[PDB]
């Protein structure tokens, strides 16, 4: 039973693996709640910059979950972030969109509830880590991409797999603790 | 389409009709969102008063973050917050009185799991965006003079006569009743001459 509603919560997206892992604060470390199949993204691998048809990589929420008219239960990633600002991108259910990440409707239901849950009870922001792929050096060496340097994200992926804590992130380049 | 999430919300329960109506603010007045079957309550008709009472409450209540999970027992419990101002004024005891999903309970209104899902999200929605309380009017039955007559000679005529004005205000204005306890009695406000 998820009697864990409204506890803080954190998300990791993996574009290539087409999945979203959703974790929940249990005492002093986040443990996997469930994880959900990404039906559609667009522009394949790489982050957003311009008419670009890419889905973003790199985000907090708060109350940008007001629905729009186009989408079902859209969670606004809040692009452009501080980094993006070098450039209505959403997580939502089965719909056809320009950039956004498209889940099953069952999946968004489950997600959206847990987020709003966490929000209701404290939880200033819910952070969301969007990666192009699982960042094991295996995949990382699978290089020579225009995006290779944007290696800025590995530390993030790494931090979490090691500590199970959302990374503390911030000159035109992401840095963590 | 439920693009109306996070709009203010109001609930009315009807014990006798075994249903919960859930309304949502559309501009100046609430419009029925959907309404849901109550699988199980207990003790049948009338408000809750002693611990042993197998009674489910009746009255006007507020919800805030009374969605803390005691899910230890129930699924998606919204605590009605009994005892209220009225209840306390008569020195009634209870706790843990709930609107919740398909679980087995003593003083609580039990919806289907599908039903509670829809409710609970709309509530948390509303509270996320402002909305200090969700008001929750729990009635023994739809309070038409027809029903009020079927139920003269009840111990609770007086009590229920205190609720009718609330039920009435809403079918009339489609705004949550401004209610308050005066001397152990609910009084339903209603504007003056201007």
Author numbering:
A (entry chain B): 36 to 85, 87 to 94, 96 to 105, 107 to 123, 125, 127, 131 to 185, 187 to 194, ...
B (entry chain A): 36 to 229
Pull verbatim passages from the article behind this deposition.
However, by treating purified sDpaA with V8 protease, we were able to obtain crystals of the V8-trimmed wild-type sDpaA. Subsequently, we collected a 2.9 Å resolution data set using synchrotron radiation. sDpaA forms a pseudosymmetric dimer in the crystal structure. The final model for both chains A and B in the asymmetric unit includes residues 36-229 and 36-224, respectively. Unlike other YkuD family members, DpaA is a compact protein of a single domain composed of a single mixed five-stranded β-sheet (β1-3 and β4-5), which is flanked by four α-helices and one pair of β-strands (β6-7). Unlike other YkuD-like transpeptidases, sDpaA’s second mixed β-sheet region (Val98-Ala145) is degenerated and instead consists of five coiled strands that are connected by only a few backbone hydrogen bonds. The catalytic Cys143 residue is located in a sharp elbow turn of the coils and is surrounded by three loops (L1–3). These loops create a shallow substrate-binding groove. Our study has revealed that DpaA forms a shallow substrate-binding cleft, with the catalytic Cys143 accessible through a single entrance, similar to LD-CPases. By contrast, DpaA and CPases have a shortened L2 loop, resulting in an uncovered substrate-binding site.
However, one distinctive member of the YkuD-type transpeptidase family, LdtF (recently renamed DpaA), carries out the opposite reaction of detaching Lpp from the peptidoglycan layer. DpaA specifically hydrolyzes the amide bond between mDAP in PG and the C-terminal L-lysine of Lpp, in a reaction that is the opposite of the Lpp attachment reactions catalyzed by some of the Ldt enzymes. In this study, we report the crystal structure of DpaA, which reveals the enzyme’s ability to cleave, rather than form, the Lpp-peptidoglycan linkage. Assays with purified peptidoglycan-Lpp as the substrate and chemically synthesized compounds suggest that DpaA’s shallow L-shaped active site can only accommodate and cleave the peptidoglycan-Lpp cross-link with a constrained conformation.
